[PDB]
UniProtKB/Swiss-Prot annotation, chain A:
It is found in: Vacuole membrane. Keywords: Acetylation, Hydrogen ion transport, Ion transport, Membrane, Transport, Vacuole. GO terms for molecular function: proton-transporting ATPase activity, rotational mechanism. Belongs to the V-ATPase V0D/AC39 subunit family. Its main location: membrane. This is V-type proton ATPase subunit d.
């Protein structure tokens, strides 16, 4: 990775400096024992966040405001890094941005099947998946008009042309099929882009981590589809991410599975996932594995994967902050220790 | 019932926040847009409490609908169950309040 | 009366409305109406909230409860006026993101007055 | 021993004479086929009182199959729970003896369908009673699992308390004196901090707090591994100043009430955690083992009832069927299955998924 610093040395340095700002386990323990939300803000100000939240009154402080402000700081940092990126690194972060542009466009077709309202959706559309022509895409009243608005002039073109037809998405449900299949196509395309235009060790610490993302998507699809028998397995096979440790051998059995026991049999098939769903909830174990993979992404020094590792680590760090803030504001401190810290 | 209502509603709100944390995104808009039919109904039937024809409400939990139950991760289903229990408690409280008014 | 699902008017917090919808909610097919009336705090007009309360409790005719999510603090007069009848709607004030103290509850106020 | 050896139970009408070895006596042919598989088996059956209708018999058979599947699942769950508790030492299955006898010895007799189980009622009533008993055993197993989860939570809390000297949650680590003992109303005279770097930085932070925060006083230091730490003296008339100094010192303060009540509460919590862990690991473990043995006996009885029902459905009444034990060598399961398939010269209603024998059920 000697060539890595010709264009991304400063970006890597800034990202590592940001990583030094991630909340350590001691910081999380300190935040856990906060009496109230205002005291949580006071103790958080001692961290790298500082006076980020001082712009609002103590009585106006709430968990939603906590999430909004911390995620806004996250997005400011990411936008700064992207603005100071060049070439394949900028394309990689652009890909990251598409990862949430998928969700924004899927949210936007909602409210276009039933054109009840607009504008408020744009306000709710989080900026990490923003694109310049999204406001133009907002005005398109008809679903078809929005389809060609996103079929061209948006980075959504290859995914939409990959598996969709302009009249097909009317019948398909946004969450069950439309967003999940778009994530699918996104994952194959992103994995291919990594395999083509990335340097080692960022190579491996992207294929493994994107494979984990595909695996968690597949597990969620398998364990959510069983409650809705309307999804026939062949479409489910067309919905599974086609990438990861499960593919090829496991994803077929997950697609053909029709009950929780079958998914268990086809899931404990591979190593990293025995007892993974037997005990507890999927979300906590998935986030723990994500943090483990991110930590590793940080073990590497001259790898552009530190950007992705920092993004996911900082997002789960703000998620942990919001979880603690909820457990305090709701006074549900009995399950405040569900935060996941690997620093 | 009203003093326990705050506790039960804040537990349900914490369950919703756990669902949001698991799903990452704010599933509120998707849930609002995904409503298609009433899965929880109030059975308005009359009683005979002390010779007065008071009317109370019972819960029609119809699992066949499951309109929003197939969206999102399993945390969505867990939060749906928790909110269904909370809504049953609130329906009992509302029936008691209607009986009190009558 | 006509058994209907509980109404949902939440202007102090839309999270409560989202949770109630995730529980269960109904939208009128032919009339394109919806029981949900989620309102953003500081964005929906108080007159608009009163109009929604009238359209649900006074205009719509069925057998159902109608949650308020403590948003009736600004519309306390309308809540008291609508509380004069137990049907076709029965009011309720579930605890929203802002905790619902029993002091501001109209039903609790009546109970305390009758104590 | 060979406790890991699989078990496949079967039965056949008294007039049967398998075509695999024509001309041989039924018991002799079975033994020779068993000798061909190096196996052994013995008769084990009980004449049920079920004389219900064909539709009633079919419904009872379906219910019995469902109940047998449920009982097997419960037995497997109990065995897994015991193995987690380091009880299934020799093997995950058949290691624990049942009714003061090992698994094959218990399988060498099936008179359990008597007295405590011989309701003498219809097969439906006995099936319902066995299902209720299995549900009670499953509830006991669930209670044991809940106790184990509580013990795990208590152990996690104890580990968090003893996670480390720095940010220690165990108040017992700090001595009773110099910990706000007999605290004055206007002066707490105690504070706890865990500064980073060397202890000189902690002294400077104490020196910073030595003015405008509290009148000058001394307190002991703490190790906190490499990170510095020290008990500090903080006043209550200027408690806000001391808290502000601690926060601004970037020393990660962790001060908390060290009163006698807090120490007593912590000691009681630790004692309760240890007691719950010991209870779940010993008494709950023994109760779960006994319940697992009972559930194994009940599942064997239910399997016998299901085999009898099948022998009344597949084979024809009047009841004259002869059952055979399930004993087989550990590696001869496939050969035994092939031999049974060859010997199944009956039940042509299938193709010229269920076994075509009069009775065929593989266990463990």
């Amino acid at each position: 990775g000697v060539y890595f610093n010709i264009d991304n040395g400063f970006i890597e340095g800034v990202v590592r400096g940001y990583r030094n700002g991630l909340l350590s386990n001691n910081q999380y323990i300190n935040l856990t024992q906060c009496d109230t939300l205002e005291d949580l803000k006071l103790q958080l100000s001692s961290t790298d966040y500082g006076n980020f939240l001082s712009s609002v009154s103590s009585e106006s402080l709430t968990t939603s405001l906590i999430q909004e402000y911390a995620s806004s700081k996250l997005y400011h940092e990411f936008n700064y890094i992207r603005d100071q990126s060049s070439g394949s690194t900028r394309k990689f972060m652009d890909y990251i941005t598409y990862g949430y542009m998928i969700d924004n466009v899927a949210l936007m077709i909602t409210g276009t099947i039933h054109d009840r309202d607009k504008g408020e959706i744009l306000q709710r559309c989080h900026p990490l998946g923003w694109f310049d022509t999204l406001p133009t895409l907002s005005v398109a009243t008809d679903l078809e008009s929005l389809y060609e608005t996103v079929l061209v002039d948006t980075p959504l073109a290859p995914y939409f042309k990959n598996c969709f037809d302009t009249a097909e998405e009317l019948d398909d449900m946004n969450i069950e099929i439309i967003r999940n299949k778009l994530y699918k196509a996104y994952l194959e395309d992103f994995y291919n882009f990594v395999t083509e235009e990335i340097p080692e060790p960022a190579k491996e610490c992207m294929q493994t981590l994107l494979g984990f993302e595909a695996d968690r998507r597949s597990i969620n699809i398998a364990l959510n589809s069983l409650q809705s028998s309307d999804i026939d397995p062949d479409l489910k096979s067309d919905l599974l991410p086609n990438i990861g440790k499960l593919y090829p051998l496991a994803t077929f059995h997950l697609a053909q599975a029709q009950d929780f026991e079958g998914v268990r049999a086809a899931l404990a098939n591979v190593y990293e996932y025995r007892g993974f769903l037997e005990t507890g909830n999927l979300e906590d174990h998935f986030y723990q594995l994500e943090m483990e993979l991110c930590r590793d992404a940080f073990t590497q020094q001259f790898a552009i994967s530190t950007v992705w590792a920092w993004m996911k680590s900082k997002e789960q760090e703000v998620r942990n902050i919001t979880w603690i803030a909820e457990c305090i504001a709701q006074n549900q401190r009995e399950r405040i220790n569900n935060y996941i810290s690997v620093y | 019932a009203k003093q326990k209502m705050g506790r039960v509603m804040q537990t349900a709100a914490f369950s919703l926040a756990e669902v949001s944390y698991a799903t990452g995104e704010n599933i509120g808009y998707q849930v609002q847009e995904s409503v298609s039919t009433a899965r929880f109904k109030v059975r308005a039937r009359q009683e005979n409490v002390s010779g007065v024809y008071l009317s109370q409400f019972e819960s029609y939990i119809d699992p066949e609908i499951n309109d929003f139950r197939l969206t999102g991760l399993g945390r969505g289903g867990q939060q749906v169950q928790r909110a269904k229990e909370i809504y049953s408690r609130a329906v009992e409280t509302l029936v008691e309040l209607a009986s009190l008014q009558t | 009366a006509e058994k209907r699902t509980l109404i949902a008017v939440i202007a102090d917090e839309d999270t409560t409305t989202g949770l109630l919808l995730a529980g269960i909610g109904q939208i009128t097919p032919e009339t394109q109406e919806k029981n949900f009336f989620v309102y953003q705090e500081g964005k929906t007009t108080k007159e608009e909230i009163t109009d929604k309360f009238n359209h649900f409790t006074e205009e719509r005719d069925d057998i159902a409860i109608l949650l308020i999510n403590q948003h009736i603090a600004e519309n306390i007069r309308a809540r008291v006026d609508s509380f004069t009848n137990a049907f076709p709607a029965i009011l309720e004030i579930p605890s929203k993101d802002h905790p619902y103290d029993p002091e501001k509850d109209s039903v609790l106020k009546r109970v305390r007055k009758l104590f | 021993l060979y406790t890991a050896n699989d078990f496949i139970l079967i039965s056949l009408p008294q007039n049967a004479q398998p075509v695999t070895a024509p001309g041989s006596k039924t018991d002799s042919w079975f033994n020779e086929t068993l000798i061909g598989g190096r196996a052994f088996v013995s008769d084990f059956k009980i004449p049920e009182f079920k004389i219900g209708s064909l539709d009633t018999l079919i419904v009872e058979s379906e219910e019995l199959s469902k109940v047998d599947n449920q009982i097997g699942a419960s037995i497997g769950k109990i065995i897994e729970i015991l193995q987690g508790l380091n009880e299934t030492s020799t093997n995950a299955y058949r290691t624990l003896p049942i009714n003061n006898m090992p698994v094959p010895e218990y399988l060498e007799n099936f008179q359990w369908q008597t007295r405590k189980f011989k309701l003498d009622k219809s097969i439906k009533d006995l099936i319902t009673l066995i299902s209720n008993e299995s549900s009670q055993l499953d509830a006991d197993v669930r209670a044991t699992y809940a106790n184990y989860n509580s013990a795990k939570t208590n152990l996690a809390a104890a580990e968090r308390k003893k996670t480390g000297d720095l940010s220690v949650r165990s108040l017992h680590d700090i001595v009773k004196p110099e910990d706000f003992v007999l605290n004055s109303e206007h002066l707490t005279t105690v504070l706890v901090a865990v500064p980073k770097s060397l202890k000189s930085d902690f002294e400077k932070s104490y020196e910073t707090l030595s003015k405008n925060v509290v009148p000058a006083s001394a307190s002991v230091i703490a190790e906190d591994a490499e990170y510095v730490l020290f008990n500090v003296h903080l006043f209550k008339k200027n408690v806000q100043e001391f808290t502000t100094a601690a926060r601004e010192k970037k020393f990660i303060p962790r001060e908390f009430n060290y009163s006698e009540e807090l120490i007593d509460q912590l000691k009681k919590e630790h004692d309760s955690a240890a007691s719950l862990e010991q209870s779940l690991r010993v008494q709950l473990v023994r109760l779960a083992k006994t319940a697992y043995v009972d559930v194994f006996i009940n599942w064997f009885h239910i399997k016998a009832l299901r085999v009898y029902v099948e022998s009344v459905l597949r084979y024809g009444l009047p009841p004259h069927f002869n059952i055979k034990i399930i004993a087989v060598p550990p590696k001869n399961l496939s050969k035994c299955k092939s031999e049974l398939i060859d010997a199944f010269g009956f039940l042509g209603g299938n193709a010229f998924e269920y076994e075509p024998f009069v009775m065929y059920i593989i266990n463990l």
